[PDB]
Symmetry: none
Subunit: 188 residues, 8 copies
C-alpha cells in the first residue's frame, strides 16, 4: 500500500521485505482506526511467510507463550491461550483509541476479566509490559507517572503481533493453517 | 471472533462480594465517557434503568451529587409537584454540564449570574442548586454570581461528565417516580432518608 | 423537556408481578429493533449484561432458540473446550442471521449447503446447529442442504432479528462463563438442566 | 419557509394565513424527522397568535383537556396534564419514524407508562384515537386491521397540536406565556 | 490507475466541429445530475463559469428556458435595477424547481396559487415567470393558479433538473453582470437580442 | 438558547437583554458554522426591536452606509448597497472558516469582485477594517503582520451586523419590514 | 467472506472453489459500491490461480482480446489494450451506480472517448454487448427498449473480468505477474 | 439570496488584460485548497478540463512543475508508449504528494530510498522524477535517497498541494492525449517546445 512507497529495497531478501512492509502497513492501519477488523487476506503476507518465528515476532515472546502453556491436548491449551490473546488485543487497541479508557494508565491483577484470561497464561503479564505497563505495584501494573501518552508505534507493533499470534492459533484449531507444521515451529 | 468483556470494565479494580456495585460503577463510567465523546448524547431508558434498579445505597450510587439533600430539602407539598420543580432544575443543571463538555463552549461559560432569569426561576428555585454548579467548577463566589477560577483555562472534563451523569440519573429517577414506573417500590423513601 | 419512558416500552402490555421479566422482554425488543436498523450493529457488554443477569427461567429468556439443547447435548469433555466449540458455532450462526438482515443479502442467501466447509466444521459440529438455521427460515430440506421456500421472496425480519439476538445472547453467556465473569454463579447449571 | 411558496394568499386574513402556513411547515418537519426538537422561536407564530382556541386546535379538543383536568391549583393540574401530553407526543412521533416500534399498531390500557400518564387525564384516550388508534378492545386500543400504515398527515397534525398545547402549558408554569390570560382562554 | 474521461461524457454523441458546444452540454448534464442526486446542492463559481464563458449562441446554451424573453421583456429602467428584479424572480423560481427534486416534496407541491404573496411579489413581477413554472410541470391552468395534471403522480426529474439548472445559470449570469465580472464583455447585449 | 443561560439579568431592560442575548447566540452559531444560513424567524429579535439604530449596530456604522449611498430612488441605492453587503458578508464568514482562503490576510482594491461591489459604496472599505484588515497599502488592505489569526468574536459581531443590515434592506425592497418607518430611522 | 458461507463444498476441487467464491465476493462488492477500488491482495485468489484462461474468464473472451491486438512489442499492444479495458471498466461500473448516467441505455460509436479507446481494439464492442448493449444501430449500440434495468449480476461479472484482465496486463508491464509465463497463456 | 463570486476569487489581485489567466489561477487555488481539505479528493474531468483547455503559455500553467522537461526528455519512441511511461510516474508522484497531505502520514514519510522497488520502476524510470520529489520537500540528498531536512517538523501544505495539483493536471493532459480528447489540437507540441 502506502508504506511500500518508502521502505528501502532489500535485494536478495524479497520475502523479508514483504513481511516487514506488511507489518508496518497494518501497524499504521491500527493507529488510524484501533477498532478495525483485518481479513485473512490482509494478514496473508504475515501468515504465509516461511520466515522463522524469531523474525516474525520481534517484541512478543511467542515461543514462551505457547511452550509454557501447552497443557493437555492442543485443543485445550490453544483455547485457553487464544482467550488470553483476545483480551490482550483489547488492551492494545484501547490504548490507540482517540478517547482512551479513563483508567488506561493501570491494570489491576484482581480485575475480573484479567484474573481469569490474561493471568491464566504464563507470559500474559509480560505482554502488558510490552505495551508500556512497566511499573510494578502490589495491586497491578502501570505506565510510568511522567509518561503522558502511549508510544503508539510500540503499542501497534505489539497489538499486531498479539492478533497475529491469535490468528495463527485459530487456524490450527480449524486445521486450516498455511504452514503444514506451524505448531511444531512454535512448540520446538 | 471477540470476547464480551466491556471496555472500562477492563481497568476498574475487582470488588469481590460487591459485584453489583462494581457493575454499576463500570456502567456509570461508560455513560460518563459517552458524554465526553459527545456532549449532546441522549440516553435511552434501557441504558439508564440498570443503573437505577440496583439495590445499592444512595451513597453508593451518587458519588459527587448530594441527591438526598436535593430531594429532601425541596419536598414541599406533594411529590406530584415538587418532583416536577426539582426535575425542571435538574434539567437546566444538565444543560450547564453538557455545555461545559461542548466542542464550542458558550462564550460566557466561565460564570453564572444569580439574576439570570432562567437560573433564578429554575435552579435557584431549589436548595442545592448552587452546590451543583460548584461541582461543575463554578467555585469562586462573587456577589454577582459564581465563576470558574481566573487561572483555570478549561473545565475538568471527567468531573463535569460525572456530575452531569448523576444529575441526569436523578432526574430520570424523579421522572420514573412521576410515571409510577420506578423499578424500586421504595425509591422515593430512600431519597428522603 | 422529555420523560424517560423508553420506546418499545410504550407498546408492550403490562405484566403485574412480573416486572423484571417485562423489563427483560422490552430490552430484548430494543436490541432486536437495533439489528433491524443496522445488521452490523455491535453491542457492548453493558447493553447485554442486564439481559443476562436477570434471575428469569431459561424458558423465559430464550423464546425461539433452544439454548438448553445447544449447551446440554454438546457438553463433551470440559467446559473450557465445548464452550469454545459451541461459541464458534454460535458465532457463525449469528453471521447467517445478520446476513439475512443486510441491505444487500449475499447472492446465495436462499440456501445453505451441508458440504460447505465453514458450515461443516463449525455449525454442523454441534447438535442443534441445523435447527437454528431452520428458525431463520431455512425450513425446506433437500439432501444437498437447507433452503428457504421457493415462493417466499424475503426473510421474516422480526423472526430473524429475534433468533439472531438470542444466538448472540447465548454466545455472550458462554463467553462470560469462559472468563469466569458471568453475573450468575449458577449460569452453566441452569443451561444443563 | 417552503410551504409558504404554495399556500394561497388570504386577503384580509393575514394573521390566520401566517398561522396556517407555520402549522403546515412544522407538520412537514415532523414528517421529515420525527425525533426533531423545535425552538420557542420556531413555535412563535403558533404561540403568539390572537386567533381563538377553536381555530388554533383543529383536531385536539384542547378545551376539554384543560377544563376537565383542572384539579386543585393550576400548578397541580398543569404538571399532571403536561406529563400526559409529553407521553402522547411520543406516541405521535413514533408513528412517523422510518422504523416504527414493532407493536405500533396497538396501545394497551394496562401499559405501565400509559396507565399513570395518559390515562391519568380525561380526554387522554381520545388523543390516541386521533392518531388512528380507533378500534376498541377490552385490552386497549388499535389501528384497523386493514390499515397498512399511519396517515402521516393526520399524525403530524395531532402531534404538532399536542406539543403546542404542552408548550403553552409549560410557559404558564413559567409565568412566561405571550398571551396575558392564556389560561382563561383555555379554561373558559 | 484510471483515465480522465468524465462520466456523462461517455454517453453523449460526438459532435465534430462543435467541440466547445459538446463540452458545454456534457458539463450541463453533470450539474443537472448533481441536482438530482441532491436537491440542495450548491454550485461554486468555478463549476458554473466554464458554462457561462463559452462563446455559444444563446439558443445553444438555453435549451428549455427562454432567457432572451426573461431579460428583454423585463428590461425596465437601468440594468442595476431590473437585473435585481429579475434575479429575485429567478431565485424564487429555482426554489420551486429544487423543491420538486426534494426527497420530501412540500405537501402542496402540486399547485401554485397566483394570490400567493411570495409568487405575487417576485415571480409574477416579471413576464415569463409563469412560463417557467409551466416548464417544471405546472401546465394545467385554473383561474386560481397553475397545477400539475391530476393524473401525473410525480414530477419529471430530468426536465425539472434541466430547467432548474438553466434558471440557476441565468441568475448566475445576471449576478456576474451586477458585479461587472461576467467573462464575456457582450453578455447583456446577447440576452437583449 | 445556550448563551441565555449565562447572560446577566437586566431588570427594567427586558427588550435590550433579549436583543443582546440573541446577538450573542447568532454570533456563536456563525463561529460554529460560518457557512450557515439564518431564517427570518431566527433574526426576528434583532429585526423587530424598537431599540435605536445606534444601539442595534455597535460596530457597523449603519447610519453612514445608508445616508452616504442613497443615490436616486430607494430602489436604486438599496440594490447597490445590498450587493456590497452581500460581498462583505462573505469576507466575514470566510474568516471564520475551519480552512480559511489561502490569501485571507489581504484584500486588494483592484480585485474584480471588490472593485464593483464593496468599493461601489462609501464606507465599504471601513467594514473590512472592522474585520481586522487594518493596515494600509497602496495595493489594498491587510491584517497586521504579527497577528496570526482573526479575532473570531470581532469577526462574528461585524459579520452578524452586516447580514442584519442587508436583511433589513431586503425587507424594505419587499415592502415587508416590521418597523413601519425603518428607512427613516436609517436615513435621518 | 460472506458468500463463502453459502457456496457448496467442492471435494477434490479446492483451488476452483476458492476462485469461484472470490469472484462472487468481488462481484457483490461491486454491486454494493460500484465506485470501489480493489487491492492487489483482494484480487490475489483470482490472479494467482493456476486455473486455465478458459475457466478464469467465463464471459470475457480474453483470448481474442489479447491475441487479436498484439501489435508490435508487448509494451505497445499492452498499453493500448489496457487503455481500452480501463474505459470498458467504467461503462460497467456506471451501470451499477445508484444513479446511472442519464444516457446509460446507449453507447455511440462516434463518442470521442469510445472512438479512440474501446474502438481501438478488436473485441471492444463485444464487451459492451456482454454488459447488455445488445441492439445494433448504425449510430451505436443499445439496451433493448423493453429492458427497464441492467442485469446487475451480468454487469458485475463482466466488470470484474474486465478489471481482472487489465490488472493482469498491468503486472506484465511491471514485470511483476505471479504466473511466470502469463502472456504465453493469453497469447497461445 | 447570495451573489455568485467564488471564494479564493475574492483575495487574488485583479489582472486587467489577463482575465483568462486570472480565472485559471483562481480555479487552480480552489483545487489546491480542496486537496488540503481532503488528501484523497478525486477530481472529475469537468473540474480539470477548464484549466487544461485555456490557451495560456505552459510557463503560465505550470508554476512549480517543469512539465516541459518531463515530457520532452522522456519522449522516447512513440507517444502511445512514453505517455504511458510518464503517466505511470506521474501517478506515483501524485501519491507521494497526497500522502504528505494525509491526516496520518505514512510512518516513513520523511525519506524516499532510491532502491525502493516502486520508485525504481516508476518514478526513477523518467528524468525529472527526482526533481518533483524535491519540490515536495525531499531536498536533502543522501547516497541512500532523498529526505526532508532533519529540523523541519511538517511538510509545507501549500507547496505540496500546488505541486500535487500540477502533477495531477499534467497526467490528466497526458491521459487526454492518449484518448485523442485533449481540447487543444496542439497540446503535445506545446509540451515538447
Amino acid at each position: 500500500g502506502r508504506e511500500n512507497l518508502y521502505f528501502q529495497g532489500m535485494p536478495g531478501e524479497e520475502e523479508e521485505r514483504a513481511f516487514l512492509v506488511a507489518r508496518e502497513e497494518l501497524a499504521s492501519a491500527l493507529r488510524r482506526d484501533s477498532g478495525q477488523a483485518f481479513s485473512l487476506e490482509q494478514l496473508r503476507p504475515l501468515l504465509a511467510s516461511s520466515l522463522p518465528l524469531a523474525a516474525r515476532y520481534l517484541q512478543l515472546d511467542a515461543a514462551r507463550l505457547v511452550r509454557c502453556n501447552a497443557h493437555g491436548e492442543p485443543r485445550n491449551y490453544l483455547n485457553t491461550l487464544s482467550t488470553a490473546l483476545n483480551i490482550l488485543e483489547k488492551y492494545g487497541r484501547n490504548l490507540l483509541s482517540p478517547q482512551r479508557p479513563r483508567y488506561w494508565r493501570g491494570v489491576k491483577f484482581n480485575n475480573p476479566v484479567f484474573r481469569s484470561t490474561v493471568d491464566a497464561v504464563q507470559g500474559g503479564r509480560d505482554v502488558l509490559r510490552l505495551y508500556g505497563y512497566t511499573e510494578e505495584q502490589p495491586d497491578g501494573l502501570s505506565f510510568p507517572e511522567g509518561q503522558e501518552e502511549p508510544d503508539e508505534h510500540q503499542v501497534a507493533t505489539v497489538t499486531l503481533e498479539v492478533l497475529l499470534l491469535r490468528t495463527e492459533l485459530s487456524l490450527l484449531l480449524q486445521n486450516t493453517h498455511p504452514r503444514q507444521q506451524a505448531l511444531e515451529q512454535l512448540l520446538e
